[PDB]
Amino acid sequence: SASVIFSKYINNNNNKLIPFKIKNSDLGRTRYFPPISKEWKNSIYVFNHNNLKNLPLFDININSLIKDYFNLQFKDKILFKKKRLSKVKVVSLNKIYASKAEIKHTNTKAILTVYTFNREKISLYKKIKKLKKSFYFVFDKIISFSERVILSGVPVLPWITESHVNIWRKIIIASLYKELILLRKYKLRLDLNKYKFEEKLLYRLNNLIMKYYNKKVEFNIVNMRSFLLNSDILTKILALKLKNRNARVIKIMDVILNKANLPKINRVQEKASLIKSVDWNLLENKFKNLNLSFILNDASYAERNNLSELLNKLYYNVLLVSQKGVWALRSPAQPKVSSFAKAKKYAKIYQIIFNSINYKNMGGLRLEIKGRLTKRYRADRSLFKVKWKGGLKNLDSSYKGLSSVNMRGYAKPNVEYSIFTSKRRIGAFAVKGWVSGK
Amino acid sequence: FKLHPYARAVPVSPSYFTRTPRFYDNYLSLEKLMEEYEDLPVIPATAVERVAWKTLEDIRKELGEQVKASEFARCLALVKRLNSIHPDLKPQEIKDVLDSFRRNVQPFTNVAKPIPIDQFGRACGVGKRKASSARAFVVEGTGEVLVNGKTLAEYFGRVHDRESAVWALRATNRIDKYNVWVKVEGGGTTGQAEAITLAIAKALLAHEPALKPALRRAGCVTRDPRKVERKKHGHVKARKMPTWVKR
Amino acid sequence: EQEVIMSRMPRSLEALYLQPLRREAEYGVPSCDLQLRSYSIRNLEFFCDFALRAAYYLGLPAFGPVPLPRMIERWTVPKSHFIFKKSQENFERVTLRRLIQIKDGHPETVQLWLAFLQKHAYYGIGMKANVWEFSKLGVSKAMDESKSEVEKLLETRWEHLSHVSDMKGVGNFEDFLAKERLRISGGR
RNA sequence: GGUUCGUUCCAUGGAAUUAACGUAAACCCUUGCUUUAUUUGUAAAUAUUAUAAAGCAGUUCACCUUUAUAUAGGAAAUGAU
Ligand SMILES: [K+]
Ligand SMILES: [K+]
Ligand SMILES: [Mg+2]
Ligand SMILES: [Mg+2]
Ligand SMILES: [Mg+2]
Numbered sequence: 001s002a003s004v005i006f007s008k009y010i011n012n013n014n015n016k017l018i019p020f021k022i023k024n025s026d027l028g029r030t031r032y033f034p035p036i037s038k039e040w041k042n043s044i045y046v047f048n049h050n051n052l053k054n055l056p057l058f059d060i061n062i063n064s065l066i067k068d069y070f071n072l073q074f075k076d077k078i079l080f081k082k083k084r085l086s087k088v089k090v091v092s093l094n095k096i097y098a099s100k101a102e103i104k105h106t107n108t109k110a111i112l113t114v115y116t117f118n119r120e121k122i123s124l125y126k127k128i129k130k131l132k133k134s135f136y137f138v139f140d141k142i143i144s145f146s147e148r149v150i151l152s153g154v155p156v157l158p159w160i161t162e163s164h165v166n167i168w169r170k171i172i173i174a175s176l177y178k179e180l181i182l183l184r185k186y187k188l189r190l191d192l193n194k195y196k197f198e199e200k201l202l203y204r205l206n207n208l209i210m211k212y213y214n215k216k217v218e219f220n221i222v223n224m225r226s227f228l229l230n231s232d233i234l235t236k237i238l239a240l241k242l243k244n245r246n247a248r249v250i251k252i253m254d255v256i257l258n259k260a261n262l263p264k265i266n267r268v269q270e271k272a273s274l275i276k277s278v279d280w281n282l283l284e285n286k287f288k289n290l291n292l293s294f295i296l297n298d299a300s301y302a303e304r305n306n307l308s309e310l311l312n313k314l315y316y317n318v319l320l321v322s323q324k325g326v327w328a329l330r331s332p333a334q335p336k337v338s339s340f341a342k343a344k345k346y347a348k349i350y351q352i353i354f355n356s357i358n359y360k361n362m363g364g365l366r367l368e369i370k371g372r373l374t375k376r377y378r379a380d381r382s383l384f385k386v387k388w389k390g391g392l393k394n395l396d397s398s399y400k401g402l403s404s405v406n407m408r409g410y411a412k413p414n415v416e417y418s419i420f421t422s423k424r425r426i427g428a429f430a431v432k433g434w435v436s437g438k
Numbered sequence: 439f440k441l442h443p444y445a446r447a448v449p450v451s452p453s454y455f456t457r458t459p460r461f462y463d464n465y466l467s468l469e470k471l472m473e474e475y476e477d478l479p480v481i482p483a484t485a486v487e488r489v490a491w492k493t494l495e496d497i498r499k500e501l502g503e504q505v506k507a508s509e510f511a512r513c514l515a516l517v518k519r520l521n522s523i524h525p526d527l528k529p530q531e532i533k534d535v536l537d538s539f540r541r542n543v544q545p546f547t548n549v550a551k552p553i554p555i556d557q558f559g560r561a562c563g564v565g566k567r568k569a570s571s572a573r574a575f576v577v578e579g580t581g582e583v584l585v586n587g588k589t590l591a592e593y594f595g596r597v598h599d600r601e602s603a604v605w606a607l608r609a610t611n612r613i614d615k616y617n618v619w620v621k622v623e624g625g626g627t628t629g630q631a632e633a634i635t636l637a638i639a640k641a642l643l644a645h646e647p648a649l650k651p652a653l654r655r656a657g658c659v660t661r662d663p664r665k666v667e668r669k670k671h672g673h674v675k676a677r678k679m680p681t682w683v684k685r
Numbered sequence: 686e687q688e689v690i691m692s693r694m695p696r697s698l699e700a701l702y703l704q705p706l707r708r709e710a711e712y713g714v715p716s717c718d719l720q721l722r723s724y725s726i727r728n729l730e731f732f733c734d735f736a737l738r739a740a741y742y743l744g745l746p747a748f749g750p751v752p753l754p755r756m757i758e759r760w761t762v763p764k765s766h767f768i769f770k771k772s773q774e775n776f777e778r779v780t781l782r783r784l785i786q787i788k789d790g791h792p793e794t795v796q797l798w799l800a801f802l803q804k805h806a807y808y809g810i811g812m813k814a815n816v817w818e819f820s821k822l823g824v825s826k827a828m829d830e831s832k833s834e835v836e837k838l839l840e841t842r843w844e845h846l847s848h849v850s851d852m853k854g855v856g857n858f859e860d861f862l863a864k865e866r867l868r869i870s871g872g873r
Numbered sequence: 874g875g876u877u878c879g880u881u882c883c884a885u886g887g888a889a890u891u892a893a894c895g896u897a898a899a900c901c902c903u904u905g906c907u908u909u910a911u912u913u914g915u916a917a918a919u920a921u922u923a924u925a926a927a928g929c930a931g932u933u934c935a936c937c938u939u940u941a942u943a944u945a946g947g948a949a950a951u952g953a954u
Binding site for chain 4: 509
């Protein structure tokens with residue numbers, strides 16, 4: 001028989017049966033749920049809060065490491081560059097800009113997301129690409145030619161050892177030293193700029209950040225094509241420009257706004273509301289009885305028995321050559337992939353994915369500079385300039401009337417706010433920046 | 439491949455300099471159809487199928503223009519005039535242009551599920567008040583009422599609350615026709631009493647649905663949504679403010 | 686070398702577009718209570734569906750996700766660091782949580798389920814599981830006989846640890862664990 | 874000049890056409906309803922309290938009145954809800 005302790009947990013069965021009720025009301029489309037990582041910088045939950053109270057402080061320390069990590073540069077002696085010493089501290093605008101880090105926490109690791117605008121690569125790639133093909137074409141001949149006279153008799157062999165290759169190589173270096181050190185310069189500076197995003201140099205930064213969270217950190221570095229798509233990178237650039245005494249405040253703000261391109265719009269259609277009407281294309285309204293025992297039981301279509309035949313009518317299937325056709329397979333080291341992975345066409349999926357994302361286009365831009373920005377070294381009064389282009393509105397709700405999901409209870413989900421504080425030789429100033437998306 | 443030597447920019451629509459080009463182009467087309475098919479017979483408005491024409495807002499968004507209400511009001515009188523033409527004699531041209539003015543908006547349907555009656559003939563109604571929730575099981579009986587196992591008098595020590603709990607049965611004069619077995623929770627004495635009023639009323643309508651007009655005038659169908667207002671910082675209570683010192 | 690017209694797709698792929706299936710419990714004795722928590726609702730509801738699909742393949746009849754009461758903390762702080770006191774504002778931190786309870790689950794099978802969820806845990810979610818198990822009287826002798834069984838399973842796992850001969854940095858073994866555990870948990 | 878809770882909307886001006894912010898909308902709690910879930914909550918249960926995710930809902934319909942015919946308003950325990 002069974003135990004009494006076991007029987008005392010069987011009788012406690014007063015469950016409610018799953019009724020499979022049929023919907024008789026019309027359902028609307030659910031709101032756009034913005035990502036979770038964009039509400040708080042640290043997406044985390046832990047049952048012991050000792051791993052939760054120091055995060056605000058660590059965010060400051062981590063962001064400092066990342067900022068200085070992306071500013072690493074070779075020593076002038078490594079690249080043989082002649083350093084031009086000077087008292088003034090040069091401000092470098094052509095480097096890698098980075099925003100504040102967003103960390104996704106689990107009990108096993110942490111994924112650190114950081115948006116970067118790589119401005120140094122834009123210069124290095126174009127500069128090195130000027131070296132015409134004749135360089136590599138002619139350099140090949142020197143290799144072959146040199147082997148005919150130095151490593152061979154006068155007009156792979158077992159009578160050519162490394163001891164001779166060394167001398168054979170030094171001859172080439174001695175004749176092309178001024179040219180190799182040049183190519184080596186741009187080659188190393190470009191590779192350094194490349195390895196900052198790869199595991200060659202990131203595994204070292206991981207060892208430095210891993211000491212704060214006691215978990216291995218995985219980096220997710222997102223390369224921004226334009227510095228206007230992230231507010232953190234924007235206020236940083238504008239702040240570096242204003243740090244110079246001879247900087248024209250109003251002129252610099254106008255040049256940035258001029259770089260911001262806003263999409264064409266019809267003001268009357270954007271500000272037009274939406275009439276609430278039942279959308280019979282929604283999968284919730286198209287099938288008010290979701291049980292397959294009713295859908296596949298010859299309800300509307302003639303013999304759609306196969307559950308796949310039903311799914312192919314609802315979703316977009318990549319496995320099919322014809323969207324509403326049939327899945328025809330072929331019947332009778334290399335990578336392990338299906339024999340049809342090459343024929344799959346992700347042309348309409350990119351539309352499905354990217355059309356289901358909101359706040360893609362840049363909607364509005366707003367800049368504010370406030371503090372001591374005068375040019376003379378005296379006790380003048382604080383300045384305050386404001387420029388904007390477009391609007392920071394949430395069009396989906398303010399005009400169309402749709403329901404949105406505010407961040408942290410009060411913030412609009414489409415705006416990015418960042419502030420950067422600096423100081424002139426006369427006082428402190430700040431640069432605030434808002435960037436909205438449509 | 440070379441461009442044409444002679445070229446000049448020309449407006450596409452003749453209403454280029456007007457306030458709303460796209461609207462007038464569509465409005466002038468109606469004026470042309472009406473002037474062309476004015477001799478065709480009509481049908482009295484009583485025999486004209488009712489149509490849901492678009493609104494001034496649907497046109498503004500569709501045409502992307504800021505159409506005027508007065509100018510659109512007269513454009514709507516044409517489609518109603520042309521719509522009155524006899525169907526059989528109505529030309530295909532007017533049938534098409536009229537289909538572009540129809541408003542195909544469907545309101546959402548939300549119908550409440552009817553309260554069933556158990557196999558033993560007891561219907562469950564649910565009522566609520568400030569913080570209380572009641573469940574009344576009304577059954578054909580003699581008039582026995584129980585609240586959390588206790589009698590109506592052993593539970594409510596205030597006759598005002600007893601009359602309010604079973605007011606639905608009293609107003610309709612059916613105290614002696616049903617037995618109620620209520621189970622209340624939360625709230626206070628008056629909160630629970632008024633919660634049972636709505637509970638029994640709903641359960642009663644499950645037995646005799648034709649009593650709702652009477653329970654309306656009795657005040658037992660409406661759900662009173664009044665709720666305690668939270669305390670607000672800077673206030674002594676929900677609205678009481680601290681003493682303000684002028685000096 | 687001919688083309689075959691597949692009549693349907695693998696059930697593993699079709700089940701991804703149906704609601705998570707559920708096994709039926711013959712007795713209904715709870716074998717595990719997994720409580721999931723998070724400060725957001727979107728990642729909590731997603732991972733709860735993922736946890737139910739894993740319980741189906743393992744033959745574990747899962748029940749839920751049961752929405753447990755929300756845990757709401759409250760703080761009222763002055764909006765100004767200095768004097769201004771008549772102006773304050775309220776803050777909160779609402780913890781959203783769910784409960785997945787498994788019944789009639791084999792003890793070992795329930796541990797593979799939990800091992801799977803931890804390996805594929807979703808960020809921003811905290812988890813806590815209470816496991817139940819029936820055992821006979823004489824626990825002292827049972828745990829002594831299973832020593833040889835556990836040793837065999839660890840023969841290939843001892844490679845994870847390595848220390849110099851006669852590790853001296855540890856000192857008192859028991860006191861090291863007790864103090865090193867506090868340092869890992871941050872104080873307790 | 875009317876109208877609106879409102880620079881709201883309509884009409885109009887021998888000068889206007891538009892942008893941003895506030896406003897409004899939306900959001901949070903609350904009210905009715907629909908679906909989902911049933912433990913650690915629920916007397917039982919053919920599922921109705923509670924718990925909490927999503928969705929729907931109003932000044933919507935009826936009645937009355939209604940300017941310049943353009944934009945509307947009123948009635949409030951005895952129309953519906
Ligand atoms: K009070
Ligand atoms: K409920
Ligand atoms: Mg005007
Ligand atoms: Mg407002
Ligand atoms: Mg239980």
